[PDB]
Chain length 108, copies 4
Amino acid sequence: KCSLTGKWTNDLGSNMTIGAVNSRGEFTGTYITAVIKESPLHGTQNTQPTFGFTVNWKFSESTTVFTGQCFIDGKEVLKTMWLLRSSVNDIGDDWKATRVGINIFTRL
Amino acid sequence: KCSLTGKWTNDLGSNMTIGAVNSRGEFTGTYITAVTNEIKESPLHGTQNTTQPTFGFTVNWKFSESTTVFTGQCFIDRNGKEVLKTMWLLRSSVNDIGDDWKATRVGINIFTRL
Amino acid sequence: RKCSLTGKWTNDLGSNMTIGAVNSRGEFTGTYITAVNEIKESPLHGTQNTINKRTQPTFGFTVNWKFSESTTVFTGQCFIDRNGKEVLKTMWLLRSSVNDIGDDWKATRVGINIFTRL
Amino acid sequence: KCSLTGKWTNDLGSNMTIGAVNSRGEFTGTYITAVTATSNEIKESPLHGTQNTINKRTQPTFGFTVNWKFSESTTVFTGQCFIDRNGKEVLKTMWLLRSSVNDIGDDWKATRVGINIFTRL
Ligand SMILES: *[C@@H]1O[C@H](CO)[C@@H](O)[C@H](O)[C@H]1NC(C)=O
Ligand SMILES: *[C@@H]1O[C@H](CO)[C@@H](O)[C@H](O)[C@H]1NC(C)=O
Ligand SMILES: *[C@@H]1O[C@H](CO)[C@@H](O)[C@H](O)[C@H]1NC(C)=O
Ligand SMILES: *[C@@H]1O[C@H](CO)[C@@H](O)[C@H](O)[C@H]1NC(C)=O
C-alpha cells in the first residue's frame, strides 16, 4: 500500500496528480511546478516498486525525467531524482544542457 | 527532420525501436540492452516536446527490478550524422528507506541510426 | 555575514567531517567519517572559490576512502540559511572501481547531502 | 602506464596538466577550458585531487576539484584510468558543475552534470 494514484506535494511546493495504474504498470497525470501551467506526465511502474516518468513542459522548451521508489516507515513518501534537459541550438553547447537534482513527495 | 521514429544503436551495442509520434508528442517502442537474470526486449514510453526538440522516455526492465529514464535532444552535425545525445538515471530497488542514498546511477549514451 | 567552511559538520545520514583552515588561495584539508568491511576516518582535499566580494562561495572536495577502492567528490555552496544558521548544500558522485573498461557505464552513483554545524 | 602525471586533452578541446603524485595519492595541476559559455577572459585554473591507493593490481580511481579563476563556479570530476580497445591511455570521467546562486530558494537549479574523455597530449 504505497500506490502512486492520487495527489502529491513536494519540498519546493510543486504538485502532481497521478491517475490509475493499469495492469502493465502504466500511468498518466498532471504536474504543476511552483518554481506555471499544468503539464501532462507519462510513466511506468515496475511489477515498494520503482518507477519512472517524463514531464513535457507546456510553457518551456525543456523536458524533465524523474525516477524513484515509494516508501513507508506509516507516512508514505516518494524519493526521486530528476534530470532537466534544456534546449540548445548547436551540438557544440550540448555539454551544458543537463541539470540534476532530487525531490521528496508526500500525500496531499 | 531529426525525427525519433525508426531504429537506433549506441556506443555500448544496445538497440531500440521507436514507433510513430502522435500529435501530442507521445511515442512507444522497444529497448534491447547489450549489457548487464538474462536480457530481454523491454517496452519504452516517452514524449517529445512540441526542429531539434528535446525528449524523454522511461524503460521498464522486463528482467530486473530496476527502471531507467533517458532524456536528450536530436541533433544534426559535424559529419552530417543524425545523433541523439542522452543522459540517463538508473534506479535500483532497495528494501529500506535508509539505503535510498545508494540506489541511483547516472551516465550517458549516444545513438546513431541503424 | 559570511560562511566559513572551517570546523565540524554533520549530515542528514549521520556522517561527520572536520575541515581545517582555508588558506589565501582557497585550499583546504580535512577528515570524513561516514555513518554508512569496517569504516575509518578518511582524509579529504578541496578548494573554495574566491572571486567577487562573495559571502556564500561555492566549493568542492574529494574524499579518498581508506577502507574501499572508491572515491567520492562533493560540490556545493555555503549558505546563510533563512534561520541565521550555516548550511552546506551539496551534490556528490561516488565512483567505484571496475576491472575492465566494458563495465565503466555502471561505475558512478549520484546523490545529495545537507550539512549543518556540530 | 596509466599514471595521471602529464598533459591531457579532451573531446571538447580543453587541456590539463597534472604534476607528481605523492605517497598519499595527492596531486596538483592546472586546467585550461576551451569552452566558457561566459564573457570569456578564460584563464589557467588550479586543480587539486587525489587518487586511491588500495589494491595496486588494477587501475585506480581518482577525483579532483577545479577552482575557476574567472567565474564564481566550481567543477568536480571523478573517474578511472584505463587502457582502451585501441591501445590508448584514457581517463573516463563524469563531472558536476555548481553555479553560484544568491538565495537558497534557487539552489535546486544550480548543478549541471556531464562527462569527459581525456587522452594524452
Ligand atoms: C498545489 O495545490 C495547492 C492547493 O492544494 C495550490 O495552492 C498550489 O498552488 C499547488 N501548487 C502549484 C504550484 O500550483
Ligand atoms: C541490434 O541490431 C544490430 C543490427 O540489426 C545487431 O548487430 C545487434 O546485435 C543488435 N543488438 C541487440 C543487443 O539486439
Ligand atoms: C559525529 O559526531 C557526533 C556528535 O553528535 C557523534 O555522536 C558521532 O560519534 C560522530 N559520528 C560518527 C559516525 O562517528
Ligand atoms: C592545449 O594545448 C595545445 C598544445 O599543447 C594547444 O595548441 C591548445 O590550444 C590547448 N588548448 C586550449 C583550448 O588552449
